[PDB]
Write a protein that binds this DNA or RNA. Structure first.
Ligand SMILES: [K+]
Ligand SMILES: [K+]
Ligand SMILES: [K+]
Ligand SMILES: [K+]
Ligand SMILES: [K+]
Ligand SMILES: [K+]
Ligand SMILES: [K+]
Ligand SMILES: [K+]
Ligand SMILES: [K+]
Ligand SMILES: [Mg+2]
Ligand SMILES: [Mg+2]
Ligand SMILES: [Mg+2]
Ligand SMILES: [Mg+2]
Ligand SMILES: [Mg+2]
Ligand SMILES: [Mg+2]
Ligand SMILES: [Mg+2]
Ligand SMILES: [Mg+2]
Ligand SMILES: [Mg+2]
Ligand SMILES: [Mg+2]
Ligand SMILES: [Mg+2]
Ligand SMILES: [Mg+2]
Ligand SMILES: [Mg+2]
Ligand SMILES: [Mg+2]
Ligand SMILES: [Mg+2]
Ligand SMILES: [Mg+2]
Ligand SMILES: [Mg+2]
Ligand SMILES: [Mg+2]
Ligand SMILES: [Mg+2]
Ligand SMILES: [Mg+2]
Ligand SMILES: [Mg+2]
Ligand SMILES: [Mg+2]
Ligand SMILES: [Mg+2]
Ligand SMILES: [Mg+2]
Ligand SMILES: [Mg+2]
Ligand SMILES: [Mg+2]
Ligand SMILES: [Mg+2]
Ligand SMILES: [Mg+2]
Ligand SMILES: [Mg+2]
Ligand SMILES: [Mg+2]
Ligand SMILES: [Mg+2]
Ligand SMILES: [Mg+2]
Ligand SMILES: [Mg+2]
Lengths: 61, 89, 65, 102
RNA sequence: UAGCGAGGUGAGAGGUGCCCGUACCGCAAACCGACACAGGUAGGCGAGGAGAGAAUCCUAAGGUGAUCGAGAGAACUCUCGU
RNA sequence: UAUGAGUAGCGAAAGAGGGGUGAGAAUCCCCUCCACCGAAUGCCUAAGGUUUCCUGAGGAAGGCUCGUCCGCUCAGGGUUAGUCGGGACCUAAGCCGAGGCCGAAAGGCGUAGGCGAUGGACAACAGGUUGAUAUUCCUGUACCACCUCCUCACCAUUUGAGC
RNA sequence: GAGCUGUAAGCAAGCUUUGAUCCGGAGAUUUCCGAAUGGGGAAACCCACCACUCGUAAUGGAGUGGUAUCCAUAUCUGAAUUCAUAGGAUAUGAGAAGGCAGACCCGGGGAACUGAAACAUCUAAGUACCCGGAGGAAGAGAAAGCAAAUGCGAUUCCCUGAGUAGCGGCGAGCGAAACGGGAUCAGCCCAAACCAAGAGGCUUGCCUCUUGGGGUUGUAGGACACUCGAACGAGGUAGAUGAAGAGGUCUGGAAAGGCCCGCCAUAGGAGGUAACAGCCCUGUAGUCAAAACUUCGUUCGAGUGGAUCCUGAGUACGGCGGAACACGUGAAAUUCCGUCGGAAUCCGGGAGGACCAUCUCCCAAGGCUAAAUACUCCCUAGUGACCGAUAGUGAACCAGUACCGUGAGGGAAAGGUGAAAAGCACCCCGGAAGGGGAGUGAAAGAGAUCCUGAAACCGUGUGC
């Protein structure tokens, strides 16, 4: 699903813009890292954005 | 299920009349009825002994009445052969 | 009529149902052979059976509650 | 309908205007009635299994129910129809007199 | 073999055995081609004489005479023969 | 609805006569001889079609003419299986696919497991019969799986037959 | 309340004042397919297992119910592996699934033709379309607002502002908002200190977590100290009652028309009836009515102090890259997304279109909230200087049919006898078709290819 299991961050659409200001569609990916964490008190490899790991509240196992 | 659900009506034709000389009785039966159910039902209803049941499916005949096309019902015909030592139906 | 049928026991109804289904069977055979004069009887017997099965089922619903 | 089988009526409209008769049959679905001696027709019937002679036959044809009125019991003149309840049972009344029709 | 196991094995005798398809066309006027259309349609069997042969010509079993005809026997056109 | 016009056409092919039927016959039926196919134009059978099959009646339309006829109209009728083909047996390609993996969403992929003949496996033959079915009905003679109210023989009840 | 067994004539057999048919409320039954869910499958088929039941010596056969997956909850097992967990099993769940308005709503994704007289920024347009989620409405919403007054006091919607301000290859075009006037009106609950109880880690009396209380804000507030099912009514879903002329007479097949007279009217709506009806019928105005189910309505714990503590953090905000804002990166505030960086916390923070200062107004990073607004597959009642059969729906009719296409899909034609079938007995020609008479009828040259019956086109006769 390429979605952060904590924050819900996911791919989002928008534009490239050339110098000539031509718009073409692109996506912004979340900076997701597959990592072992407790998911209902069960160690599991899930996707977590770097941003959600930045604090250190989301504790790896 | 009731035996009388199984047998619907007798077939009265020249063919059916000829088979009755050979002690063979033709019935229309419920289209879901297997030939065991027909054997069981004929013995239950008429108090006869059945040698064999042969069974066939007829498709519906396409039909016309004026401007309206349709289809007769599907039929399941059973030919019930009684044993030689048996009462007639 | 149903008023009369409700006076009977379930067992007595189920016997009458069995008895009518035999009658209906015989009528259907008479109709096939072309012997049956009173064709209106077929409809009466079918509706009698229906009436009885309705009463039976009312009692099942009355009990299982 | 404001009249029924067996009612004495007067025909108030048609060729049979002013002719009285009894309603022999009612046809609620068509709002027509069959009145004795009224609106006779000559039916040219072929031989059948029932009638193997065939022939031309004078029979009543039905008329529209709004072309007949029931007669007042008292005066014997045409009346409009009302309804009162006697003995917990609704009856037609001649609006002209008050007398019950049926 | 692992297992299961107090009743088994074999042979008689008696018995039980359901559903779906089954018509008819199928090199065809019934299928695919708008048509009772010179086209297309997998497979099995496929006789005799002469023959290497399923070629070829004439026949067998069997099938068929083809859904507009009668004349006339010009030009011309087509298919053939000299 | 005209014109073109009573014109082009009527879709490969051998018929002839006698008899019949009938309101009506080149065209339907019967007979006779003739002719055509014959590794087919015969017999069987797929797929497909779906009653077109058989019988009786019919002739408006359909049929490139005609029509008494018909694959057409109307009525009735006709398809019978333990053993044939398919299922209650097997799997191939492929397809579906619990969980799973991947992906803005929809979804894509895929494991266990399934489905899936065009293949593997698997017990019935000859003759006869109807207007219309026939390894299906009937006759005769079989075979296969399973069952045990029974019969006989044999083996064994825990180093105990058997499955 | 007297007929009825639909279309559909008809024969047949029956039913019904001991109340039928018919209309309304509530039930029952409800094959198979379909989310389809026991497993399979080419939808409407096939094949099972488990209980229980029928039947059989028994096998075979039959009946009823149960048996999908995922989710939640509880229990029992607890691999590698010690504990354990993963996994497995069972039970309980009116838990989910699917459909549907061709509408309206909120999100995710998102064109191009086209315009710019070419075209790329721009437009078309956040449109069409696809996807997700709904709800009877949705969304929004109780000020980190609007403003710059003696201010205002949630949101939505309408009018206006205004084609203004502005944006814009400053081109084509795009285009507000606040004030003002209206519709409708409604405000609330948490998180946090802190308190009580309990559990947990004891770090060893510090911290964590559960439950309850407490508390809810801005010229701050708070903690914390002290102080007081029923009943009834009106509706809906069937119905009931309901005034007054066959008035005379004329024409006519028939009178609702003409002429001459009456009458009713809280009723002169409408439809029907043999031509045009307030008084013939069904009705209408008015007045009534419900066993049952259903809708709506009505009734039956506060001030004064402020030592401290608390007041939403990977948040606000910033850089980079995009999007949304009428606003195209611009002088570019405001809002959101990705990425990286990253506050303060009342001595605090946000906004007032870069930015700073001053002032003014507010208190974000939690949630809920009716009405005014949008729309109509439907149902009920009604309306129209809307259509009248090539029109009006594609469809007045057995039409999404026939027919066409492998499929998605495309998609017709076709209304009128008569007041009533009285739908032509009988005779004659003909195999029939079809005619000629005779009948019926007002009319048959209204005879089913049946109201009228134009033109093209086809004929017969003949004056020139
Ligand atoms: K056969
Ligand atoms: K050859
Ligand atoms: K014939
Ligand atoms: K078989
Ligand atoms: K463009
Ligand atoms: K009338
Ligand atoms: K940022
Ligand atoms: K900006
Ligand atoms: K149309
Ligand atoms: Mg069979
Ligand atoms: Mg009245
Ligand atoms: Mg055959
Ligand atoms: Mg051909
Ligand atoms: Mg070939
Ligand atoms: Mg040869
Ligand atoms: Mg000529
Ligand atoms: Mg000629
Ligand atoms: Mg010419
Ligand atoms: Mg010529
Ligand atoms: Mg020619
Ligand atoms: Mg020919
Ligand atoms: Mg034939
Ligand atoms: Mg012809
Ligand atoms: Mg097989
Ligand atoms: Mg897959
Ligand atoms: Mg899955
Ligand atoms: Mg095969
Ligand atoms: Mg075999
Ligand atoms: Mg045959
Ligand atoms: Mg199923
Ligand atoms: Mg341009
Ligand atoms: Mg809301
Ligand atoms: Mg009334
Ligand atoms: Mg008229
Ligand atoms: Mg706050
Ligand atoms: Mg400023
Ligand atoms: Mg017209
Ligand atoms: Mg139309
Ligand atoms: Mg088709
Ligand atoms: Mg005329
Ligand atoms: Mg008229
Ligand atoms: Mg006309």
């Amino acid at each position: 699903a390429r979605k952060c299991v904590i924050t819900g961050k996911k791919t989002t659409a928008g534009n490239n813009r050339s110098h000539a200001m031509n718009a073409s569609k692109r996506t912004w990916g979340a900076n997701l890292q597959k990592v072992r964490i407790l998911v209902n008190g069960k160690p599991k490899k899930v996707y977590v954005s770097a941003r959600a790991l930045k604090s250190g509240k989301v504790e790896r196992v | 299920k009731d035996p009388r659900d199984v047998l619907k009506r007798p077939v009265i034709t020249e063919r059916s009349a000829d088979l009755m000389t050979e002690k063979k009785y033709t019935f229309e039966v419920d289209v879901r009825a297997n030939k065991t159910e027909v054997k069981d039902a004929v013995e239950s209803i008429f108090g006869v002994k059945v040698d064999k049941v042969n069974i066939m499916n007829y498709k519906g005949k396409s039909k016309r009445v004026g401007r309206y096309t349709g289809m007769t019902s599907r039929r399941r015909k059973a030919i019930v052969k009684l044993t030689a030592d048996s009462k007639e139906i | 009529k149903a008023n009369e049928i409700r006076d009977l026991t379930t067992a007595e109804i189920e016997q009458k149902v069995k008895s009518l289904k035999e009658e209906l069977f015989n009528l259907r055979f008479q109709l096939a052979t072309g012997q049956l004069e009173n064709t209106a009887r077929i409809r009466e017997v079918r509706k009698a059976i229906a009436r009885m099965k309705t009463v039976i089922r009312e009692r099942e619903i009355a009990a299982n509650k | 309908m404001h009249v029924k089988k067996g009612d004495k009526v007067m025909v108030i409209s048609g060729k049979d205007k002013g002719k009285q008769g009894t309603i022999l049959a009612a046809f609620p679905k068509k709002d027509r009635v069959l009145v004795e001696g009224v609106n006779m027709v000559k039916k040219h019937s072929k031989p059948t299994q029932a009638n193997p002679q065939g022939g031309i036959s004078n029979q009543e044809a039905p008329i529209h129910v709004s072309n007949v009125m029931p007669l007042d019991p008292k005066t014997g003149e045409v009346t409009r129809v009302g309804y009162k309840v006697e003995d917990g049972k609704k009856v037609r009344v001649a609006k002209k007199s008050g007398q019950v029709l049926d």
